[PDB]
Design a protein around this ligand. Structure first.
Ligand SMILES: [Zn+2]
Ligand SMILES: [Zn+2]
Ligand SMILES: [Zn+2]
Ligand SMILES: [Zn+2]
Lengths: 342, 342
C-alpha cells in the first residue's frame, strides 16, 4: 500500500541497484519512519551473496537504522511524529517462548530479521513499536548508528557475564571496528583494558584517546606468558581463524572468554585449557530490546560512538567489496536521508 | 616422628606394595585421624603410572578419605577425638591469592594435593583443620566417601552455574562413576533429568535405578533432534573422546554445558554451535572447602551416596588394573580400617 524505494540485489553476485517496492500501512502498533542513516557491516555482504543459503531475491539490505518518525498507529504512546529512533536487526519474535517472556527475545527460535521482508536501506521503514528504540539527543545519528549492531553485540555479553564493573581486567582480542567499540564500552565501565593483537602496528591506536591500559602482542611469547592468569574476561572479536588456547591462558581461574566472530575453521579446545582453572567460553549474538535501550543511553552518557566513514547511496556496491572480511575501523554508514532519491 | 604404614609404588609400573614411612607430629592446628575408608578413582591409577609427568616415587595413593579423629592440636576447637571426618584432594593452599581469600581455594595456583606428600591409603593421616570436614552422622562412611571427589566435582559447578533449582531441565551425559553421582544431585535439586547415553543398554538403569525423567540415545539422530533446544544445562561426565556439538544442540539458548572429563583429543567446536543461541561451555575441577561442607550436608539431607564396591588392601593392585576399563560399579572403596595391618 505505502510506496517505497531502495537498493536491492537480483542474484547472489551481491550487486545492488535502484529498486521500487512497497511496505505495509502503519498499523495500530506500528511506527513508520524516514531512514536517515543505515549502518552497514559483514552481515550485509554475506546476506547479499547468500552465504548461508537462506537469502531470497530480490534482497534489500539494511539492519542498522536511525531515522525520524513519520507516522504512529492509534495505540502507540511511546513515540510521536518527529522523534529520532533506532532499529536493530531483530524486528519480530514469537512472543510466547521462554526467551520472549524473559525479555531475551533476541534468542527467540522464530526471531525475524529486518532484512527478511526487505531491509531498511530504503526511504521508509515500518516497525512494530516494541522493536523501536528512542534515540538519545546527545548521540550523533551517523557515528552512533553502528552501536545498534557492534555496540549491542559487545554490550549484551559484557552485562550478562559480569564484565562490566570498575577494576575488572578485561582483554579485547582484535581491534577492527567491532573491537574498537567493545574497547570503548570496557573503558566506560571503568575496566582496566588490555588489547590483544597479532601486530605492534596496532599499539598506538590501542592507547589513543584514554584507550587501553595495556597492550599484548599475541605472537610475543614472553609478553603473553607475563600476562598468564591475569584477566577477568576477554571479548574475542577476531573474525577469522584463530586458536582460543592463548586467550584462555590469559584468564584468571573462573574467567570468561566471550566469542563474537564466526570463523570458518572450528576451534580446537583441549579439555585442559578449560579444566585448569575452571574457565568459561561463551558466544553471544546481538541483544534484547531492553539491553539495546540500556546500551544506547549508556553510550550517550559516556559519549561512545563508532568511527565511521559516511557514504552516499551510489557508493554502496564499492563499500560492500571493501568491508568484505575487513572488520574495518571506519564502519561504512549510508546517508539515506540526504542521498537516496526516487 | 609419628610412625605410619601404607601402600606405595616404586616406579611408573603403578604396582603398589606394603610401605613404611612416617608423618609429622600433630601441630597446633592439625588433626590426626585413623583412616577408615579410602575412596579410589582414575586419578589414582593415572598418578601411579606418572601419566602427567609430576609424580615422584615412592608414591602413596589416597585422595578420598573418611576417618576417625585420634589427636587434635592445642588450638583446634572445631573437632574432637572420636569425630568422624572427611578429607578431599586439596589439603593446603597459599592463603594469600584472590582464589584463597574468596574461598574458592581449590583454584589456588599453588594448591597442594594430599598425595604429593604421601596419600592417605595409610593407617593414619594428619591434616590442617581448615581442610577437614565434619562427617554428617546420617551418611554412611563407605558409600559416602566418594562424594568427596565425584560429588563435589558435580556439586560445585551445578551451584556456580545455576543448574541447581527445581524444574531445571538438566542433561547428564555419561552414566558411570561420576555421572551416577551427578544424576543423584540433579534429582535432589528437583531437576527434570535427561540421561544422554551412547547405548540403549543403559535406559532401564537410567529410569528404574536413577529415576531419570527422559533418556536419549546419542547415536539415534531422530531422538537427539527431537530434544533440540530443550535443556537448561548438561553435566558432561564422558571421560573419553567425544564431540560437544550434539550436546550443545540439546541446550536452550543461553544454556550451559559443564565439562568434567579430560579426554585426550581436543574438542572441535564450530563457532555456530555456540553462536546460535549464545551458549556457554565451562569446565570445573573439584570444589572449595565451603562448597564441600555445604555439599556433604546436602548429601546427608537428601540420602545421596555413591554406588561402591568395597575392597581389601590386598585387592588394590587388581582394582587399579580394572579402572583402565572402568570395570567397576561404580567406585572402588578400600576398607583401610579393617584390612590394612603392620
Ligand atoms: Zn551490522
Ligand atoms: Zn519467541
Ligand atoms: Zn577420586
Ligand atoms: Zn592461593
Amino acid at each position: 500500500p505505502v510506496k517505497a524505494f531502495g537498493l536491492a540485489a537480483k542474484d547472489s553476485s551481491g550487486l545492488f541497484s535502484p529498486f521500487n517496492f512497497s511496505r505495509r500501512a502503519t498499523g495500530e502498533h506500528d511506527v513508520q519512519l524516514k531512514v536517515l542513516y543505515c549502518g552497514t557491516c559483514q552481515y550485509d555482504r554475506e546476506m547479499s551473496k547468500n552465504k548461508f543459503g537462506f537469502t531470497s531475491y530480490p534482497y534489500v539490505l539494511g539492519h542498522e537504522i536511525v531515522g525520524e518518525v513519520t507516522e504512529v498507529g492509534s495505540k502507540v504512546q511511546k513515540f510521536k511524529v518527529g522523534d529520532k529512533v533506532g532499529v536493530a536487526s531483530i524486528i519480530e519474535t514469537c512472543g510466547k517462548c521462554e526467551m520472549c517472556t524473559n525479555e531475551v527475545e533476541n534468542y527467540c527460535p522464530e526471531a525475524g530479521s529486518i532484512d527478511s521482508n526487505y531491509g531498511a536501506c530504503s526511504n521508509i521503514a515500518v516497525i512494530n513499536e516494541n522493536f523501536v528504540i528512542r534515540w538519545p539527543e546527545n548521540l550523533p545519528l551517523d557515528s552512533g548508528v553502528p552501536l545498534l549492531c557492534a555496540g549491542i553485540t559487545a554490550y549484551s555479553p559484557m552485562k550478562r557475564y559480569g564484565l562490566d564493573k570498575p577494576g575488572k581486567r578485561i582483554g579485547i582480542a582484535g581491534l577492527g571496528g567491532l573491537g574498537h567499540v567493545a574497547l570503548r564500552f570496557a573503558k566506560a565501565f571503568g575496566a582496566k583494558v588490555t588489547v590483544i593483537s597479532s601486530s605492534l602496528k596496532k599499539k598506538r591506536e590501542a592507547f589513543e584517546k584514554f584507550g587501553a591500559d595495556s597492550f599484548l602482542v599475541s605472537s610475543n611469547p614472553e609478553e603473553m606468558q607475563g600476562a598468564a592468569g591475569t584477566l577477568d574476561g576477554i571479548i574475542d572479536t577476531i573474525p577469522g581463524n584463530h586458536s582460543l588456547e592463548p586467550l584462555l591462558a590469559l584468564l584468571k581461574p573462573l574467567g570468561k572468554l566471550i566469542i563474537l566472530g564466526a570463523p570458518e575453521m572450528p576451534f580446537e579446545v583441549p579439555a585442559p585449557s578449560l579444566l585448569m582453572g575452571g574457565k568459561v567460553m561463551a558466544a553471544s549474538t546481538a541483544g534484547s530490546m531492553k539491553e539495546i535501550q540500556e546500551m544506547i543511553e549508556f553510550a550517550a552518557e559516556h559519549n561512545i560512538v563508532a568511527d565511521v566513514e559516511v557514504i552516499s547511496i551510489d557508493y554502496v556496491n564499492t563499500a560492500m567489496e571493501r568491508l568484505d572480511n575487513s572488520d574495518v575501523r571506519y564502519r561504512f554508514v549510508i546517508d539515506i536521508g540526504n542521498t537516496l532519491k526516487s
